Amino acid sequence: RFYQHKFPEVEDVVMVNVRSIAEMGAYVSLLEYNNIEGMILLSELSRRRIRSINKLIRIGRNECVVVIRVDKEKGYIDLSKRRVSPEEAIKCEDKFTKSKTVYSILRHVAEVLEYTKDEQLESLFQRTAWVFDDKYKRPGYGAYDAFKHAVSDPSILDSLDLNEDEREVLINNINRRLTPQAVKIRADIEVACYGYEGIDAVKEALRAGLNCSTENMPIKINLIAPPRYVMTTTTLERTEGLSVLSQAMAVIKEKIEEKRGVFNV
């Protein structure tokens, strides 16, 4: 499924779930093409004298296996750990996860006449995955398959338009599961000042409220905390953070000290 070139290449990385363990080996079910079941191998679950059987593997979890060299009837389907010595691993976990999302939006194509039994799944997958080897980099294929469903970002979207363009996918499915992730943050303020340079500066505290209303775009200051208020920050961009920090510390670093007031973080 997840790339129809099924039997993968020589010294690559993949992950796998282990549905059942054998008498001797541990025959694992690979998932980067539908329902085969591989194995494990002897020597390198380490690089020195470990030699044990069940303290590494669940009946149920995943891990980052590494392939050495697989052929067909030489029977060497390589599921082990060889030489991840400085090597990153979890790129393939994110490849796995994004391909699972690619499945999850396309396992339900499943149009409204409930035909779960067997619609030919390649009839809706294969033509929608076929031309997407546009560049050779497989992590580049990772960012390009992540680029595949952020549907407005490839607005050159031609080459087997299926339909008018993407009909059943773009009615709600492309649009339906954007899955944006954001964490609420609430960077505060505490500015005030006193004097007659403090009456100028309490005018300047009110226009500091005006100023973090209109200049650098902190949005929708509400009045819920009667001593001192809040300014909002939400990641659709995440680069509002350094701008808000630069301007609030420019306030504390040049604005308040010229007008002799009180403020900190």
């Binding site: 054998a22 008498e23 001797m24 002897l42 009837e73 030489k74 029977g75």
Partner: protein
Amino acid sequence: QVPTRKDYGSKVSLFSHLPQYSRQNSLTQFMSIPSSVIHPAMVRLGLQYSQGLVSGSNARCIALLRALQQVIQDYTTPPNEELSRDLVNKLKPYMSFLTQCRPLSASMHNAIKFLNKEITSVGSSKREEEAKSELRAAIDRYVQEKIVLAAQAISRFAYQKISNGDVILVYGCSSLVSRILQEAWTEGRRFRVVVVDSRPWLEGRHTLRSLVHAGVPASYLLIPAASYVLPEVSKVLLGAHALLANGSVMSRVGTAQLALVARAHNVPVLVCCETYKFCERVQTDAFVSNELDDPDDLQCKRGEHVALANWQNHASLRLLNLVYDVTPPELVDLVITELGMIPCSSVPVVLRVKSSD
């Protein structure tokens, strides 16, 4: 592959994790009687286990060894399934078959683990026939070195141990305790061996007959009166099937209580188990992994007025009989094996120094 054997009569309330059989109906009442669903040597060894024909100590190991060598050294090597890895998974119906027949001695488990480890040691890169003959050479050198060289090595060492006039007892059915007896006897020695046995096997027979044909003076008493050998025993040879990793040993119904009544005098128990018998499964109680033979073999011959013929007429009476047992590691002190005379609790440290390190 194979069906299972039906139950006969009733059972105790305790042992319902354990199946019971009969030898009045067996496995091959029904199945593929020209054996090609399963290899022929398997149904051979199975239905001669069902009448107890090879019920020995390491005799059972060598019986399954000849059966599996007649499996492997005529084995068709199919394509589209790999050189070394269509054997062991097709051997899963073999030992599940014999587990259905009458369950395994742990000796056969050690045989399974060794030929397992060796058929992994030859994979794909060699042609199947001379790889099969190298498997023959490996399994033959294995059983030869371990079984035979262990028997004569402990014969030389226990010949250095046992001296004149040592009146030693056996609970006798093996091919190692009577072995050590005869090839210690025939070198200028003297010791009055006594055998003990038990209902319903009534087995001391191979040992006592082989002693008398080897010319050793024998006596005889059965474990339901084992408190009459209670003072006069000088040492005791205990023939154990398996030897676990507590320090325990492992043999029949009739090494259960002679072990404790001869710990109750400081007469040093002496068990005989070679390097082949050091297992890894570790039990503690006596009903956990213990078989149960045919429960209507315990009847009486009192003219014809037997009590146990129509025992299914009335409501709640039962029968049972256990077969194997485990003794605790307090009692058992000295094992008879190769590298020395290792004691009880220090067993599995030998089992790690012949386990690929």
